Design a protein around this ligand. Sequence first.
Ligand code: PCD
Ligand code: FES
Ligand code: FES
Ligand code: CA
Ligand code: CL
Ligand code: CL
Ligand code: CL
Ligand code: CL
Ligand code: CL
Ligand code: CL
Ligand code: CL
Ligand code: CL
Ligand code: LI
Ligand code: MG
Ligand code: MG
Ligand code: MG
Ligand code: MG
Ligand code: MG
Length: 907
Amino acid sequence: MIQKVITVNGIEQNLFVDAEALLSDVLRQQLGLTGVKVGCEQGQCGACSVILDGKVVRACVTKMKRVADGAQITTIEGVGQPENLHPLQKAWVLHGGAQCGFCSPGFIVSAKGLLDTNADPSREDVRDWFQKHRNACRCTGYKPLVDAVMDAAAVINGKKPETDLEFKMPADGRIWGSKYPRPTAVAKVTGTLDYGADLGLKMPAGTLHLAMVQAKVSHANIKGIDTSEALTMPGVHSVITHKDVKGKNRITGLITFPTNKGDGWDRPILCDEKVFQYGDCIALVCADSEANARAAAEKVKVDLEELPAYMSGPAAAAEDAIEIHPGTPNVYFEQPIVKGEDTGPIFASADVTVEGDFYVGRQPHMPIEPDVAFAYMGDDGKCYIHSKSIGVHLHLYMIAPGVGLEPDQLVLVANPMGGTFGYKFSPTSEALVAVAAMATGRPVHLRYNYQQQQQYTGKRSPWEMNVKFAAKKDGTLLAMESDWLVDHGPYSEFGDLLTLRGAQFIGAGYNIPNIRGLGRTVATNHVWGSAFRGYGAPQSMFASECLMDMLAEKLGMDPLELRYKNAYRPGDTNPTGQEPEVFSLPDMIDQLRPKYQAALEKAQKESTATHKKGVGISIGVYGSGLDGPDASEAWAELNADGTITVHTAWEDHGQGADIGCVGTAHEALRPMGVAPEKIKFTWPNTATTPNSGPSGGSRQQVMTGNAIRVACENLLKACEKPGGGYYTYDELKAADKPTKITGNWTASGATHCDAVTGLGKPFVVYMYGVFMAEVTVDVATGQTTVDGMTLMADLGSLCNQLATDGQIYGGLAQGIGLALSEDFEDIKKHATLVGAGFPFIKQIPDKLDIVYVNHPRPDGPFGASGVGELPLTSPHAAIINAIKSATGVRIYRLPAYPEKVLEALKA
Ligand code: PCD
Ligand code: FES
Ligand code: FES
Ligand SMILES: [Ca+2]
Ligand SMILES: [Cl-]
Ligand SMILES: [Cl-]
Ligand SMILES: [Cl-]
Ligand SMILES: [Cl-]
Ligand SMILES: [Cl-]
Ligand SMILES: [Cl-]
Ligand SMILES: [Cl-]
Ligand SMILES: [Cl-]
Ligand SMILES: [Li+]
Ligand SMILES: [Mg+2]
Ligand SMILES: [Mg+2]
Ligand SMILES: [Mg+2]
Ligand SMILES: [Mg+2]
Ligand SMILES: [Mg+2]
């Protein structure tokens, strides 16, 4: 051990440390500076950036031996605090740079390091800096972060007053549609929002820290578990196995389709009989610290009989394949799509037909914050779980029978969280921590490291797809055929539903009167499927939007014009036979056309012998809602102090549940003149907030936004005074009148898609968009650079433009990853950010352009649709279409790795 006297955030610190200790651990654990965020722990993400003697370093890979006596360290806490914000922090808030906020302290500290060395950076200087220092963001697409740095720099340089970094209430007084900052932004930019790992450090000494004993093979029969050595190791309390589980030890898929061949009870909480995928949790070590738990978990011996594993859908789907879940076929679900007339005769007589085989793979969510959760037994005797769940009510019912609790004896709460992008539509750690809390009676905390986040949370499910179009010479689509095989890994939750998305979205965007198709779901031993932003559309629409360009090519038609010819117009129906609710695609295409033409001209002019530029188009469509008559509930409450609390379970991945609540309520409450700062939101809690439903399917703004709107309208009525005006809280209480008022809303016009035909009206609101990608391909290496992305977006009406711009930029960036670099195919190689192709700032162009072409929705609150998943529906199709434009190469199977492109170029 050594004494080091240094200065941290301007304060002399008398430090006692191990010279080998990591600075991240010292700062977080010994000094309580939890504003230093730790994600990857491998120097790849920049979340733990601190300034050490004028240099920006990653604390997670900086040992204390590298910190000299007299050193100066600055963390986010030293940059600024609430009510004492640094210009960088103010700028972050104003520009909406904090979505989940997990990367915000690291970017801001890093940016201070930049500005301290280069006071007047160009935008490229800022990008170069964040690339060098590995500052990674999965939410924002980087552009808002650069905007914030530039604005802060201008203030620090005296070019504009610092007061310009403070939001100014718009001239029309409308918060709805504005850039009003989100309520949680100040906490995020000051490092004072506690995420699950932060909370773990601030839990009492009585807390047990868990480590998972995980399968190191993909498929096995389990014969036994020996915990003897582990029990003798430092700090170990106990080891938990399936024997300690008080319920069914199975998670239920809950809404398993009737024609699913499996009962939906296939997923264990702690594996008992079998390993179904690499990483499966077989036991939990409980110890005094994460480090001690992990060390002991390594010593738990599992006796396995390894079985042949099926590591892809086609492998598991073979007729003679062995059943992974004995008694259920590996292909456990099929969904037909049967619209209009038989397609065979139509293809036979059509002027033109095209077909393609496409593949979209096992995209990893890669939030900067790895999964984390904790649980404890309350004094009320209930089991409380706090996690990254984005569907707290959903998860309560998925896990209660398995852990052995009645629904009222378990409470799920959503912690502030550093992104999920859908992986948290699935239970991950909730049942594990519940079982451990129940078994020990003690608080328990479980933090995954980044390899566990990659290997042992769910993934986008790969689809193998074949799609065909028949059309007239003039480009009019006549018919479509489709086939898709969904590799869902071993756990069935929502796999059938995902497969149905193929019937809804393959070919979406166009009038196609005749469709015959079939989707199939297959269990495999690769990672289980969890929702990933777009949930079936990125697969479906990659196939159909690439196929549209192939059809255009075969017709000798421009691919934007082919889309214009076919795009939804009044009288048309979508693939499930439903009339679209608005018709904005022709408008969007017309507005994009001259930009597309100019982009083509630029690509021709600026191409060189080795660097070929191209421009690609695609359409995206997705529903806002869960299928059928989805519904939500909110409570609007007038508090004693005149503030209003809007109670919902709108789960915040980081997308902006807070501002969605405040902005929607503010608009609804305008007749009573309620200032936005007087409107409070509630964090999701199954015991104390209404069942607003999960934040999946880009549904909350529509469903919960409507519920909030209704609740507020109902509160206005409750407050209305005879003769005009409004009662105060005191007046209402004196009259014994209610002050907490419920609102409900249902998408009553929706119907579930039919099990035989796939036809129905599954969503009452959809999101519509048109993408344009501009790329350069180095034809010597096959490397593609995306130089620009444009999204024409119809969101109906914006609740908040900082929120929606950010959603779109974030989605476009994930599209670039999906197109060019991302996968989770190799269990070890893809278990790091860099290994799996995470897009760092230089991979995302500074030119991310949005054009809102909003057509108010009949059923949306104030006309709004959702936004969340729109920008990931098909940006990767536009990108691949752009590579084709540039070079003549079509990549059918994502991602377009450089060697893959190069092989195609040279074929
Ligand atoms: N018009 C409009 C719309 C919308 N908005 C906004 O925006 C946001 C979103 O919304 P939406 O669309 O409704 O959604 P939500 O439901 O809330 O959420 C969810 C989503 O969200 C997204 N985004 C995001 N972001 C972030 N940052 N992070 C994350 O993680 C995430 N995730 C993702 C996903 S995946 Mo799934 O679960 O797969 O189905 S689905 C999803 C919010 O804040 C709101 O309010 C506005 O403003 N306006
Ligand atoms: S770089 Fe330190 S936590 Fe990722
Ligand atoms: S705001 Fe950057 S990772 Fe979420
Ligand atoms: Ca201890
Ligand atoms: Cl030492
Ligand atoms: Cl700028
Ligand atoms: Cl504004
Ligand atoms: Cl069914
Ligand atoms: Cl047919
Ligand atoms: Cl014709
Ligand atoms: Cl290919
Ligand atoms: Cl490569
Ligand atoms: Li919810
Ligand atoms: Mg100041
Ligand atoms: Mg027609
Ligand atoms: Mg025109
Ligand atoms: Mg490979
Ligand atoms: Mg090769």
